[PDB]
Amino acid sequence: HMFTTKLAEKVVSAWKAKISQPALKAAQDGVIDTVAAALGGVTEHSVQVALKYVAATGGSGDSKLWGVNQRSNMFDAAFVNGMAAHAIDFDDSFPVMRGHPSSSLVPAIFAVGEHVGANGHNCLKSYVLGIEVVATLGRAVGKGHYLAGWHPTSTLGVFGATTAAALLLGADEEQLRNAWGIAASNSCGIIKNFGTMTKPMHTGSAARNGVLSAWLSMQSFTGCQTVFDDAEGILAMYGAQPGPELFNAMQKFGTPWAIIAPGLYKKSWPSCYANHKPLAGLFAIMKEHGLTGQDISHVDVGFLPGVEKPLLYMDPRTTEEAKFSIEANIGAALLDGEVSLASFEIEHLDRPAMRAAMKKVTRFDMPSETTFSGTTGYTDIVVHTADGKIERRIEATPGSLEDPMDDAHLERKFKDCTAWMPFGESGLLFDRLRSLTADQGIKTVQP
Amino acid sequence: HMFTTKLAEKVVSAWKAKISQPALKAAQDGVIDTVAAALGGVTEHSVQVALKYVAATGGSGDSKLWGVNQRSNMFDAAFVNGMAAHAIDFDDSFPVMRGHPSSSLVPAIFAVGEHVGANGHNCLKSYVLGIEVVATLGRAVGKGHYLAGWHPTSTLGVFGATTAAALLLGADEEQLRNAWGIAASNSCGIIKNFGTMTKPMHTGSAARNGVLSAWLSMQSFTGCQTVFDDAEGILAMYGAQPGPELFNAMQKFGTPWAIIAPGLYKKSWPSCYANHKPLAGLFAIMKEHGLTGQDISHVDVGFLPGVEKPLLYMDPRTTEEAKFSIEANIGAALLDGEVSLASFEIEHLDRPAMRAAMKKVTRFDMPSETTFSGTTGYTDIVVHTADGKIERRIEATPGSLEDPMDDAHLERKFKDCTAWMPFGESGLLFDRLRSLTADQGIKTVQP
Numbered sequence: 001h002m003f004t005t006k007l008a009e010k011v012v013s014a015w016k017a018k019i020s021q022p023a024l025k026a027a028q029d030g031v032i033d034t035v036a037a038a039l040g041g042v043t044e045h046s047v048q049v050a051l052k053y054v055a056a057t058g059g060s061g062d063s064k065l066w067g068v069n070q071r072s073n074m075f076d077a078a079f080v081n082g083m084a085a086h087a088i089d090f091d092d093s094f095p096v097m098r099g100h101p102s103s104s105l106v107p108a109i110f111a112v113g114e115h116v117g118a119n120g121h122n123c124l125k126s127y128v129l130g131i132e133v134v135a136t137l138g139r140a141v142g143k144g145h146y147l148a149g150w151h152p153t154s155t156l157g158v159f160g161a162t163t164a165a166a167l168l169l170g171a172d173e174e175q176l177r178n179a180w181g182i183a184a185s186n187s188c189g190i191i192k193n194f195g196t197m198t199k200p201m202h203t204g205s206a207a208r209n210g211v212l213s214a215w216l217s218m219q220s221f222t223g224c225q226t227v228f229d230d231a232e233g234i235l236a237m238y239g240a241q242p243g244p245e246l247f248n249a250m251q252k253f254g255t256p257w258a259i260i261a262p263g264l265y266k267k268s269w270p271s272c273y274a275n276h277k278p279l280a281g282l283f284a285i286m287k288e289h290g291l292t293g294q295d296i297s298h299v300d301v302g303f304l305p306g307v308e309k310p311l312l313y314m315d316p317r318t319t320e321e322a323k324f325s326i327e328a329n330i331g332a333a334l335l336d337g338e339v340s341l342a343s344f345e346i347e348h349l350d351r352p353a354m355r356a357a358m359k360k361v362t363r364f365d366m367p368s369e370t371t372f373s374g375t376t377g378y379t380d381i382v383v384h385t386a387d388g389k390i391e392r393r394i395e396a397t398p399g400s401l402e403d404p405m406d407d408a409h410l411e412r413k414f415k416d417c418t419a420w421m422p423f424g425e426s427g428l429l430f431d432r433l434r435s436l437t438a439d440q441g442i443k444t445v446q447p
Numbered sequence: 448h449m450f451t452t453k454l455a456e457k458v459v460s461a462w463k464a465k466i467s468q469p470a471l472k473a474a475q476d477g478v479i480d481t482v483a484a485a486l487g488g489v490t491e492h493s494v495q496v497a498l499k500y501v502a503a504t505g506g507s508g509d510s511k512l513w514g515v516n517q518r519s520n521m522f523d524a525a526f527v528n529g530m531a532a533h534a535i536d537f538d539d540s541f542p543v544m545r546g547h548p549s550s551s552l553v554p555a556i557f558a559v560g561e562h563v564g565a566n567g568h569n570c571l572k573s574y575v576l577g578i579e580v581v582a583t584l585g586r587a588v589g590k591g592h593y594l595a596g597w598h599p600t601s602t603l604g605v606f607g608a609t610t611a612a613a614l615l616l617g618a619d620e621e622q623l624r625n626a627w628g629i630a631a632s633n634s635c636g637i638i639k640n641f642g643t644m645t646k647p648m649h650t651g652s653a654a655r656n657g658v659l660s661a662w663l664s665m666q667s668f669t670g671c672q673t674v675f676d677d678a679e680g681i682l683a684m685y686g687a688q689p690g691p692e693l694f695n696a697m698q699k700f701g702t703p704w705a706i707i708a709p710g711l712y713k714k715s716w717p718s719c720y721a722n723h724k725p726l727a728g729l730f731a732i733m734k735e736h737g738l739t740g741q742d743i744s745h746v747d748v749g750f751l752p753g754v755e756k757p758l759l760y761m762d763p764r765t766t767e768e769a770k771f772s773i774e775a776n777i778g779a780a781l782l783d784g785e786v787s788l789a790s791f792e793i794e795h796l797d798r799p800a801m802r803a804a805m806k807k808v809t810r811f812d813m814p815s816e817t818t819f820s821g822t823t824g825y826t827d828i829v830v831h832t833a834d835g836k837i838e839r840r841i842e843a844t845p846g847s848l849e850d851p852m853d854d855a856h857l858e859r860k861f862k863d864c865t866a867w868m869p870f871g872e873s874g875l876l877f878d879r880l881r882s883l884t885a886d887q888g889i890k891t892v893q894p
């Protein structure tokens with residue numbers, strides 16, 4: 001009769017069974033995208049401070065810190081790597097959760113999987129199942145949680161990381177239920193911290209707390225075993241309707257896997273998803289009409305209810321703030337004809353030409369009776385030119401199943417994020433990442 | 448003109464100024480009570496697992512782990528000692544926050560204080576200010592936050608620990624504001640985990656997260672500097688009213704210090720405060736009427752609205768559950784004539800005569816138009832004897848200013864919690880703890 005008990009049963013049963021090759025491919029791709037995003041951000045101050053924290057702990061272990069020749073214990077590796085995976089806002093999104101599940105899950109899987117000597121098939125399976133848990137919780141809580149000011153990336157993401165870690169550590173149903181209980185008291189993170197270094201800490205903390213919750217569970221450390229149930233349970237606290245309605249969230253568990261439908265949404269640009277339909281539209285108009293930024297006097301960008309929320313900065317002053325500014329995103333597109341890893345570097349952001357481009361951009365509300373997100377809905381833009389206004393509606397979100405990132409584009413993203421690596425090492429890492437599908441030991445990958 | 452900005456100003460100004468001797472005395476007493484509670488709980492499985500975690504991290508440093516001959520880094524020392532401080536539910540409460548602030552604050556102060564080589568006066572002052580901050584936030588949030596299912600001990604206690612650690616680390620106003628922003632994304636903990644080992648983890652995590660948030664802030668790691676303000680801020684999210692009204696919560700900052708009025712409520716028994724007016728009344732009836740447990744056939748215990756919430760277990764099966772059971776508390780009182788450290792040990796809980804005593808206890812609802820807490824309001828009990836029923840209303844909460852714990856009793860509590868220590872070492876430690884008032888180095892105390 002308990003939602004928590006039923007979910008743990010479904011998860012552990014699926015763990016013991018074979019899982020579809022399409023699910024494992026989707027997981028493989030998620031790993032590559034998440035490691036790419038991390039390696040594109042390891043120079044950020046946030047990550048550099050995370051490394052200082054590791055020095056300050058005196059900790060040691062066998063779990064690799066990505067992008068540096070250092071290892072630490074599984075908890076602190078998950079912290080550092082989860083920070084890194086979110087540091088430049090280039091990791092995936094997941095509309096069912098309204099957040100970024102992979103930037104906690106993948107770090108947790110590498111940290112624990114390296115510690116226990118797991119092989120690729122099981123690592124990838126644990127990712128599929130962690131995503132399935134996050135999708136279930138996301139469906140249960142619905143739209144209000146994010147709108148209330150919580151960052152579901154961490155508030156719900158911690159349970160994904162917990163699930164995968166617990167499975168890899170050998171949890172049974174009881175240990176998994178206990179782990180989720182522990183994790184529920186470590187579910188945190190708020191949207192008001194967007195545009196600061198605390199945002200990537202959400203995923204570092206969620207990864208670390210997921211690993212810790214699972215590890216504690218294996219030591220007979222107790223937490224509530226029905227933590228998703230009842231008004232007192234964390235899902236109700238976050239706005240779910242407790243009781244029989246909850247079970248609707250898991251009615252199609254694994255049929256299909258949420259990692260395949262709607263799937264992980266892979267970012268084409270390192271910034272908030274609310275920028276992305278606008279950018280796709282703008283680049284399309286520029287390409288189709290043969291316009292550069294010099295031919296465009298203004299761009300109006302529309303937002304459905306609930307979509308503009310994270311775009312907190314109209315005049316961003318730091319690299320982190322710029323990722324949450326449509327003005328900076330569209331301004332860079334107009335000035336440079338592209339948005340890249342370098343676009344939000346403080347040196348580029350502070351260019352006088354960039355500040356002028358940003359002034360060409362205005363926001364407007366699009367009417368609706370319901371609310372949407374950066375990864376859903378549709379966008380209206382208006383591009384002003386010498387010969388009049390060009391209006392466009394963008395229906396497909398870049399990275400969704402309606403505008404998916406294919407293998408060639410994912411490889412190019414990986415290449416771009418790892419351009420700093422020394423001769424040949426990016427290619428070799430890419431091949432090793434892909435070997436998880438061949439059941440290679442995850443410890444051999446060493447990102 | 449922001450609440451957050453004003454609060455940081457008040458705190459930092461007070462830090463630079465001298466503070467009254469009564470406030471320092473109240474801080475000294477809180478340190479002693481907190482260390483006592485911790486040392487009474489260091490053999491609990493929760494703490495033993497915390498020490499296993501420290502072993503797993505490979506961490507090292509100069510911050511002493513209480514009750515063992517081991518040291519680690521400041522983050523992990525705060526975690527272990529915060530766990531210990533709350534492990535047997537004997538640490539203080541604070542009605543303005545409806546939680547236990549000292550069990551995160553005092554571990555944070557020892558961890559950071561030992562690291563930086565602080566002296567007693569500054570350590571005690573940081574405690575006073577930490578408490579002032581959590582009192583301000585508690586007043587802002589009001590009654591609804593606990594009733595909604597969050598554990599204010601950790602959701603708000605993290606800010607206490609952050610404040611004291613930041614001050615000890617040398618924070619200015621900007622750094623303090625940033626540290627609070629970082630902490631607000633690490634504010635967590637739910638009441639559904641009461642009666643499990645996750646409850647003391649609330650305080651370990653809050654202590655560690657407070658130390659970490661303060662430390663991060665000193666590395667120019669950013670968080671929101673207005674995190675207590677607006678609908679988007681953590682206080683509003685927890686049910687405070689944003690806007691000018693927020694300032695009402697800090698209007699008499701330090702006049703008087705909240706650590707003096709209403710002060711820290713020191714527990715006479717190692718269990719949930721909702722058991723304590725009932726216990727006081729029962730022991731008073733037994734004393735006044737010359738009754739033992741065998742003379743008493745039944746005890747009815749009343750609860751005002753909002754007070755019974757944490758007493759989740761009517762048939763507790765573990766040591767942790769028994770602390771949240773009026774049946775176990777009154778049962779032990781009837782059977783043994785006292786409630787002690789040993790009452791909730793599993794061997795004692797499992798005594799047939801103890802289970803028999805527990806069956807003598809029933810709960811009832813007391814009517815009111817408002818809600819109360821274990822540390823406020825009043826309690827009706829009815830004690831059934833051969834020659835009739837004895838009714839009593841208990842108005843004063845044990846440990847409040849209306850029924851305060853004096854020096855002799857606090858000293859007895861310390862003695863009882865440390866009786867396991869090698870000959871004479873408890874008294875030596877008691878004297879070293881009192882040396883903080885003499886501005887001795889905190890590094891010298893070594894609980």
